[PDB]
Amino acid sequence: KNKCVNFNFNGLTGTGVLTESNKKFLPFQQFGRDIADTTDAVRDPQTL
Amino acid sequence: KNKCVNFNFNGLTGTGVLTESNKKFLPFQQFGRDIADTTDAVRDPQTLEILDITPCSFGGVSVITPGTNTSNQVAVLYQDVNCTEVNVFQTRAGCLIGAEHVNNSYECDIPIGAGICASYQTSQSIIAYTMSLGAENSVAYSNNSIAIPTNFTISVTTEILP
Amino acid sequence: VSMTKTSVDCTMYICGDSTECSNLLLQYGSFCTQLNRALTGIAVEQDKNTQEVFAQVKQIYKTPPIKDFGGFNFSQILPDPSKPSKRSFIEDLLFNKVTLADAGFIKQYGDCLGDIAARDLICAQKFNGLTVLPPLLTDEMIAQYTSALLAGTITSGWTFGAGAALQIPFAMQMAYRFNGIGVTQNVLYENQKLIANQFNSAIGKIQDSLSSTASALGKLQDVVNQNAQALNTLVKQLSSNFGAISSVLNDILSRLDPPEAEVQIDRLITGRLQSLQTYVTQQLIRAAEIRASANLAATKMSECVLGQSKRVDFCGKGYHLMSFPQSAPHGVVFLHVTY
Amino acid sequence: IANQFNSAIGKIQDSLSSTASALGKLQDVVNQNAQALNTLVKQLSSNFGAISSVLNDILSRLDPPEAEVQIDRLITGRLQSLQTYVTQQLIRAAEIRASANLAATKMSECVLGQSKRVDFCGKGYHLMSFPQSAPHGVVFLHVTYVPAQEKNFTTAPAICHDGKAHFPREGVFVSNGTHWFVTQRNFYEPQIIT
Amino acid sequence: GAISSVLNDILSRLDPPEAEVQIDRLITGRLQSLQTYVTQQLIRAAEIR
Amino acid sequence: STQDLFLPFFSNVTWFHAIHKRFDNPVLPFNDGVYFASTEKSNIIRGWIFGTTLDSKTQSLLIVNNATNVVIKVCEFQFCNDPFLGVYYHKNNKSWMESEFRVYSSANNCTFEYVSQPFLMDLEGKQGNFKNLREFVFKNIDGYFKIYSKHTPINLVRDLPQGFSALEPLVDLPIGINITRFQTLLALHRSSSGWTAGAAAYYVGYLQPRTFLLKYNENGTITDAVDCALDPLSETKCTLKSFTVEKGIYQTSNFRVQPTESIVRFPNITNLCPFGE
Amino acid sequence: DLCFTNVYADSFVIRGDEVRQIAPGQTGKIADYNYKLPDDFTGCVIAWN
């Protein structure tokens, strides 16, 4: 957390910074997106 | 004929209107095209007749409405058509459905076009009025009259430019 | 002053009467919204450019029927009630020597359907999503916006733009505009029968310059031409193959699968969008040319018609006295009275 | 005049605090700058003819043989978005510079001097203008000479005293009905015709 | 976006079935360059005028 | 802005009910897709049968609930003309328990079967208001049946309430069939054709390929939606991308005329090509 | 759905290794020498054992 890394969540690769959020995903939802359609948030599949 | 359909002539599929024409195709010619290169006319292969292809979705649509905070009643101005497709009134810009004709010419509140302006006034609905040119003043003019002020005012006019 | 208000339907122009193309076109999102915002931004400011020139006073002025002008004949500049549109003889020559479209901005669907004219420019654009918006200020009204500014110039002098209309005789109006340019006012009354004959003969030279020579209005004819040709160019843009195997949207929908059509239709969409991004670029640069001329026309209305121009050779050759507004197709024609 | 002018400055407070749409011209300059920056974010959500709009998806799905078919569609779609945006900025900057050259004309001639140009700095005979700081612009406070109360007067071009015409050097000929007076054009101050 | 920038390379390497994939990328890249350039000229000509 | 099969706003939906003399389980089309919405109090909506001709000549989907497991089967069903599941003989020791299983007669060639976890549903009868709202989205495109479930408590006697609810996908069913006609199960009670029906309601509306706007909150729940094909007011919302239309005029598009029917005109020849030659 | 104007059948028998050579833009003893397909070939190739 709190460092510019090369993340890989469910095969989605990219460069980003992982921080905690107040967003609560629905149980069928995994990826959060933005206006620019890029992935703004993901969900950790191991722990909730 | 005379209806917007989904034609299929020799495999060429599209949306168009089939009408009769005075065009006579050469015996080796099947498809007629336009400036835009799209197929403007085809030939019926079963019986010898010539049909044009007129594109559908004709007539511009203007949206004459106030803000959603004020009201939701709208007036739709249909350009380039009469009031056949569809408080019905015909303007100089097109068919205007949803705005009542008012002979009282007021200041232009909503700029529409073709000398027509609208506003949301009083049971409140969109009214349709001719755009007034202003308060008409008749200048009393002669060869021996002049108007010269005995008193004036100092008005600060605010002109705002980027 | 103004130009042709064009609102191109970028949903119809890119995908003409197609559902499978419109399902691909709505994946592009805000491309058809940003081009229609710029065309609406033209449609607001060109009605504003007509507002800033012809409507500079809140009151409409008319001339009295008793005409006492001192030999000056103003019947050629004042509107005629015998015509169905209140226009002068000069304004009738300005609307006739400029080629426009058909009468009225409402052309019926049955006029294009019941009679397909060979090489008809107006219908063929409207079946490609090219809609011409009518202006807010009609030519029947523009002939009366100039009539309100002319009646204030004749009857009230130049005080109608600086406040209320304050009348002054035209013999006193010409004598006091001579003092603005440096001429003593005694020159006028010693030759009042001569200047009224020199001025009325110069108004007759306007008839010989507009009726015989049709190239004097070629500046505003070019404004109509660059609007009409670019609308007619945009129809010719659809005949380009765009790098694809064909230019027609209906051919690829009838030949190739949607796996193989998205290779080809997206070449047509990009070729038609760049054509619209070419056209909106050509319109905004042209609208910046007209608005710079409309701000020049509003400068030649406030300073040159509503007042007396001390600016040397800004309103033509000679010491400028006054100017007469005349209604013109998408513009204005001034009649500068020079010394 | 000091009471008429100071009451007109109080009308500027009633025109700006109550009516917030008087600054809508410079609000539109901020809006056309803010929306076009916000439009350019919405340009990234377009699929550009490719299978997706996101650069990180094609890097995670397709090989660089098959990604150069797809990423170069995204690069062309993002470059044409910028070449449209720079087109929208330069035409807008040509509009502001034409207004800034108009604002520099209304600063040198209308604030630093007295404008003889009729109705160029607002309605009325312009006296002076006050510069005010504005967001990405300027607001002028034009001091104008506007007539308020007027009367109808009988006029004449010249006067026969000894058989020779008398014309005013500066002013007009007016009368209240009995005697002919002399005054200037923009104010009625009756004097003896000498 | 093509495999090379030179028109003479694709005419010497690829067939006209495979060159129209590549040359039309060069034509679009050169036309949009001219579309950008004429845009840069007309806005500059509006500044000079 | 999304583009898929949706139910248009202010559309013509159906009016079918169950009561002690109106009993309705009709044959309804599903050309493009149907929407479901039911106000219930006694769990009368039990399921559906999705088929092509509703016969053993084709392969059909049967999603039911036998009060223990959510039964989803794709078999070759012997389709009965009136499927139902009744609760019997309450007068002493009620317990709201089933006896018959009348949704089909026989099932062979079963290709897909889903049995959920066992649960105890309260099938008791209520009076007055409807306390449950079960809404479903039914579409079968590319052999991929998408269902969307949403349950919220309501207080309703009558006509469908003016409100909004974002429907959420529950499962994904790879059924792989053709669905043209369908029916709906109902529950029957009596204090085997002299039975009655409890109070129930269900609404069917046809899905269309329309474009919606989706306004999300800070939590991710959709607050309001706008169909782009209602009126030129709502098409301005799709163009401006804001629900608050400013005071002015925005040119949206042209007056679109949809095609009525497909016209095919080919040359007339009856001789086949020499494929054997 | 689509139908064609002047259908011409190109019937011959070659070796099984050289069936892929029948394509617009290939070579071989069949493609380059005697049976060549055009660069703008809009057609279908049907082959079997």
Numbering used by the authors:
A (entry chain C): 535 to 582
B (entry chain A): 535 to 620, 641 to 676, 689 to 728
C (entry chain B): 729 to 1067
D (entry chain A): 923 to 1116
E (entry chain C): 971 to 1019
F (entry chain A): 50 to 69, 77 to 247, 255 to 340
G (entry chain A): 389 to 437
Task: Copy the relevant paper text.
Moreover, in the same cryo-EM dataset of S-3C1, we additionally resolved a ligand-free close and an open S trimer structure, termed S-closed and S-open at the resolution of 3.0 and 6.3 Å, respectively. The S-closed structure resembles the tightly closed ground prefusion state captured in our recent study. In the closed state, all three RBDs are in down conformation, whereas for the open state only a single RBD is in up position, which is thought to be less stable. We have recently showed that in the ligand-free condition, SARS-CoV-2 S trimer dominantly adopts a stable tightly closed ground prefusion conformation (no RBD up), with only a minor population of the particles in the open conformation with one RBD up. Here, our structural data showed that binding of 3C1 or 2H2 MAbs could trigger dramatic conformational transitions of the S trimer (especially in the S1 subunit region) from the tightly closed ground prefusion state to the unstable, loosely packed open state with two or three RBDs up and released FP. Of note, compared with the S-closed state, the S-3C1-F1/S-2H2-F1 structures both exhibit an untwisting of the S1 subunit region, with the fusion peptide (FP) released.
